[PDB]
């Protein structure tokens with residue numbers, strides 16, 4: 554029945570007095586969490602949702618101006634949480650959604666208890682005393698090339714995301730979900746992503762943040778995780794996954810899922 558629920562393909566699993574909210578990153582959808590879910594449903598109510606613009610969502614619902622800013626997705630998340638009666642959730646966000654949840658937690662502290670983030674990135678391009686892994690003008694040229702030849706850029710983007718070797722599970726699956734997006738919509742999201750800068754707002758994120766990422770993510774260098782750990786306003790903790798790629802929860806579940814389970818269940822002590 555819910556308009557908001559069907560628009561983001563919301564799925565509710567398990568049961569419990571605490572709700573775990575699962576968000577996904579660019580190029581994929583809530584199916585990226587298939588390895589984590591069966592380990593949560595016994596102890597938690599689990600809510601999954603798709604970002605607006607994902608290949609699984611209605612392209613007519615993608616407001617290009619409203620989603621030109623990160624705050625537009627934040628409004629969506631808050632609406633989803635309200636619609637399904639979610640308070641003080643454990644938000645587990647992958648990449649983009651993690652920053653969406655971070656911003657949302659500032660607007661609505663009541664909806665969030667803490668955040669577990671995977672491959673989080675407050676800013677893509679490098680700046681002074683901030684290392685994002687990419688020079689700003691290089692990012693701009695890569696975006697421009699993505700406009701001219703979308704197919705070939707997206708074709709090369711998939712191995713970069715999945716990382717390391719090789720033709721694998723995550724490779725074919727991420728490539729599948731990546732090409733289910735409408736080209737102009739995917740271009741819009743990348744423009745927004747490469748455009749935002751959460752660095753001045755990091756001190757305002759005051760709820761506990763669990764910072765998780767792979768030791769070899771081409772999109773997110775280790776320095777980014779260490780930057781978040783230092784600039785977050787409240788409690789924070791960092792754990793690196795000894796693997797390659799941007800989607801460790803899909804590419805290497807055997808070593809990633811146990812880490813996610815721990816940080817979901819464990820609370821950072823005071824000080």
Ligand SMILES: [Cl-]
Pocket residue numbers: 578579648649
């Ligand atoms: Cl992303």
Ligand SMILES: [Mg+2]
Pocket residue numbers: 558559560561562
């Ligand atoms: Mg739907």
